[PDB]
Design an enzyme around this catalytic site. Structure first.
Site, PDB file in Angstrom:
ATOM      1  N   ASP C 212      -2.382   2.962  -2.542  1.00  0.00           N
ATOM      2  CA  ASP C 212      -1.206   2.504  -1.800  1.00  0.00           C
ATOM      3  C   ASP C 212       0.025   3.157  -2.435  1.00  0.00           C
ATOM      4  O   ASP C 212      -0.087   3.796  -3.490  1.00  0.00           O
ATOM      5  CB  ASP C 212      -1.076   0.972  -1.904  1.00  0.00           C
ATOM      6  CG  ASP C 212      -1.002   0.492  -3.361  1.00  0.00           C
ATOM      7  OD1 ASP C 212      -2.060   0.232  -3.934  1.00  0.00           O
ATOM      8  OD2 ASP C 212       0.095   0.433  -3.948  1.00  0.00           O
ATOM      9  N   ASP C 214       2.703   1.309  -3.512  1.00  0.00           N
ATOM     10  CA  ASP C 214       3.422   0.140  -4.011  1.00  0.00           C
ATOM     11  C   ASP C 214       4.397  -0.407  -2.933  1.00  0.00           C
ATOM     12  O   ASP C 214       3.936  -0.700  -1.827  1.00  0.00           O
ATOM     13  CB  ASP C 214       4.061   0.441  -5.379  1.00  0.00           C
ATOM     14  CG  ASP C 214       4.387  -0.832  -6.148  1.00  0.00           C
ATOM     15  OD1 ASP C 214       3.529  -1.726  -6.179  1.00  0.00           O
ATOM     16  OD2 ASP C 214       5.501  -0.958  -6.674  1.00  0.00           O
TER      17      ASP C 214
HETATM   18  C1  MTH Z   1      -7.014  -6.117  -6.265  1.00  0.00           C
HETATM   19  S1  MTH Z   1      -5.464  -5.341  -6.025  1.00  0.00           S
HETATM   20  C2  MTH Z   1      -4.819  -5.580  -7.681  1.00  0.00           C
HETATM   21  C3  MTH Z   1      -5.638  -4.872  -8.763  1.00  0.00           C
HETATM   22  O1  MTH Z   1      -5.527  -3.485  -8.489  1.00  0.00           O
HETATM   23  C4  MTH Z   1      -4.647  -2.791  -9.370  1.00  0.00           C
HETATM   24  N1  MTH Z   1      -3.541  -2.304  -8.503  1.00  0.00           N
HETATM   25  C5  MTH Z   1      -3.788  -1.609  -7.353  1.00  0.00           C
HETATM   26  C6  MTH Z   1      -2.621  -1.285  -6.733  1.00  0.00           C
HETATM   27  C7  MTH Z   1      -1.576  -1.811  -7.554  1.00  0.00           C
HETATM   28  C8  MTH Z   1      -0.100  -1.843  -7.494  1.00  0.00           C
HETATM   29  N2  MTH Z   1       0.602  -1.275  -6.475  1.00  0.00           N
HETATM   30  N3  MTH Z   1       0.540  -2.455  -8.510  1.00  0.00           N
HETATM   31  C9  MTH Z   1      -0.105  -3.010  -9.541  1.00  0.00           C
HETATM   32  N4  MTH Z   1      -1.450  -3.032  -9.627  1.00  0.00           N
HETATM   33  C10 MTH Z   1      -2.213  -2.465  -8.680  1.00  0.00           C
HETATM   34  C11 MTH Z   1      -4.342  -3.784 -10.496  1.00  0.00           C
HETATM   35  O2  MTH Z   1      -4.666  -3.174 -11.750  1.00  0.00           O
HETATM   36  C12 MTH Z   1      -5.132  -5.066 -10.194  1.00  0.00           C
HETATM   37  O3  MTH Z   1      -6.187  -5.363 -11.136  1.00  0.00           O
END
Ligand code: MTH
Ligand code: MTH
Ligand code: MTH
Ligand code: CL
Lengths: 273, 273, 273
Positions: C212, C214
């Site tokens: 993604d 963010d």
């Molecule tokens: C299940 S989505 C959240 C998990 O994915 C990771 N993740 C994925 C996208 C993302 C983001 N935009 N910001 C922070 N963590 C994220 C993190 O490490 C967390 O364990």
């Protein structure tokens, strides 16, 4: 059917805003809220008031039970939460006594639980990753902004709140640094209150009242407790009038789809085994 | 009547700086200090020495009892605290072996109690919001700066210390980032030592000794424990001479109004029920 | 003799990557690892697989036992650890589904033990100040990069990971701010996993998969759990193929001097009484 939780901050937690008041002490799976819930009405609108720091201002911002506070308001049936917060200004144009209807935050807290889904409670099972792109309810913010204008109050239509751990105030190097990061105002309480409200599917908005310019003006006098409390005594009436005039408008707006979308966002943020 | 607390840092906590030395183990409401207090004199000036890490350097910066250390020095009657700290340089012009008489800090610590007013002790009742615009005692700093000049030592008259949680050193991305924030030197111990000293109404100043350039020079060799200890062994005499020459000047300056203003600032920072 | 620990992240912890699999539950001085160790082979190379979140994804990133996980892999004889992590992209050019072979981190975590040398265990005595200038194993990273190219996969040869505490996602103000600090990707798990691996003298590398953008594109749709899991389902095969193809090359490279230098760096980082 709307029901408005009100969380009153420093100098801005006056129960006399509500008519038909009844005290109710409650418990939650996360412990006791900061104080009794005060049930009452503003015109025909059901409200629940809660002093963030207890009515005697005895609880430091790091130790406020944000989880219990939000859980309690949710359990009492609140659809919305509107709060007040005293804050420092990090922008020349945000003068002491101005209202800021904040739309973003930067977290500088360190010691604070930010989720109900901490593994320790059957009430909230699994891992919850709540989205924070839009932390504050846009529709509530719009009504606050329009109402501040109708009242003739100096009001800012957006702003980024940096929430520090405290209880100390910031150093000058920190104050300068927060400005470069894009923070506009500074407090010790927005995070994780806003985060937990989102996990609860509650429409959350914040009336920030600027009380000082923190300490980024080296030439000027720095923030202190006495300076903050003085500004709040002089300007508290503004937040009171804003709440009193806003809440009846909230009561006559349609909210089912907004609340449905928050409920869905909260529900789909949870990973189950 | 002045009494100077000395908190000795890494490589810079030599009890032989004091004459007429007596060991005194004490307790506080926040637990035991890092080690025994060493009572003694520099010329006619009463001093109290305390090894930040214990005299065997056995305590990690996150786990240092900053509360007990400052409480103990206050209770023994210290009006001033002057400390030493080993630090990394974040600026080309701050060379290993240079002294930096720091005037600001940026907090990057996460796990640390920063106030005596934590609700758990009758000794410190209420909520304390201490101002941090001017964290270090200007008058003590001025004497340190003038004395470093009289000694012919390479000395910087200001500087912003970033205090990291540790015990790891910073990544290169972090080191770069701290430079953009305006940090000049980096350690693991200034915060919350400086904050608690302010709550205690103590005149606090810090002799920072640069030991390395952290790791922001990719081309150059990065910081390590051995590199730090080597620089301190080579330069410790400078901090010792600076303390020995500074303290008698502090003893003959007038301090009642400076100390009165700190006492007032500390007292009025407390919210009572 | 090499032995490769594999720590599988969100959507990327599939035990079927190993042949000749045997489950082994272990204990450590820091408690139980996230799940059983899965012993197995990729071609002739001994591997140990560990699901970071448990195989049912039941453990939140703040509460993952990073110490036990790394200790367990070290005790089983792992010389290398290669991990997968799901992350948000903070750069236009890092598209969802891209791999990023990260080389730096910025810590935004707050509640996490980052060292084995916490004073509470005879197993790790003293104070350890591990260098973090080069947190990820360059030689392993080079093989990952070359192997991604041989596979025709969109791959970035460097990148700075910001690790947030979570479990909430970032605000938009935070996302913007991390970009100005020089972060390229964002997760909740790199720190302190990378730090503890370094203290253990383990060659550590990370396969970050962007899922993604963010929320720094206000105009575009923000990250959510469903969006993340969707991207991982579509792209998990890429990380699997990268691991499967990389590990045999690691097995035939010479590692004694690289591992000796890590062992020395770890050993000399410890201060003893
Ligand atoms: C299940 S989505 C959240 C998990 O994915 C990771 N993740 C994925 C996208 C993302 C983001 N935009 N910001 C922070 N963590 C994220 C993190 O490490 C967390 O364990
Ligand atoms: C009683 S003054 C401190 C209280 O007011 C808020 N406040 C007001 C001004 C201010 C500032 N400049 N920095 C941080 N918090 C502040 C904080 O949230 C805290 O609970
Ligand atoms: C024994 S080396 C680590 C100790 O020295 C200080 N120090 C010295 C250099 C340095 C650096 N580059 N970054 C952080 N702390 C540092 C810290 O406060 C810690 O207690
Ligand atoms: Cl930070």
């Amino acid at each position: 059917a709307v029901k408005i939780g009100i969380i009153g901050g420093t100098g801005l937690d006056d129960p006399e805003i509500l008519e038909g008041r009844t005290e109710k002490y409650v418990d939650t799976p996360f412990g006791k809220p900061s104080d009794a819930l005060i049930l009452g009405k503003i015109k025909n609108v059901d409200c629940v008031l809660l002093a963030r720091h207890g009515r005697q201002h005895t609880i430091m911002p790091s130790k406020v039970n944000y989880q219990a506070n939000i859980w309690a308001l949710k359990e009492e049936g609140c659809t919305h939460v509107i709060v007040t917060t005293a804050c420092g200004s990090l922008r020349e144009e945000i003068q002491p006594g101005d209202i800021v209807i904040i739309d973003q935050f930067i977290d500088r807290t360190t010691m604070r639980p930010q989720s109900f889904y901490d593994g320790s409670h059957s009430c909230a099972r699994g891992v919850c990753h709540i989205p924070m792109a839009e932390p504050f309810c846009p529709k509530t913010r719009e009504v606050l902004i329009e109402t501040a204008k109708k009242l003739g109050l100096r009001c800012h239509s957006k702003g980024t709140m940096v929430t520090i751990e405290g209880p100390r105030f910031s150093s000058r190097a920190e104050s300068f640094m927060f400005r470069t990061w894009g923070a506009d105002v500074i407090n010790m309480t927005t995070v994780p209150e806003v985060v937990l409200a989102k996990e609860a599917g509650i429409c959350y908005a914040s009336i920030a009242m600027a009380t000082d310019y923190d300490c980024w003006k080296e030439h000027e006098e720095a923030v202190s407790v006495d300076r903050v409390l003085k500004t709040l005594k002089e300007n508290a009436n503004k937040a009171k009038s804003l709440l009193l005039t806003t809440i009846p408008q909230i009561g006559s707006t349609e909210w089912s789809e907004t609340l449905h979308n928050l409920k869905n966002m909260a529900q789909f943020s949870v990973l189950l085994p």
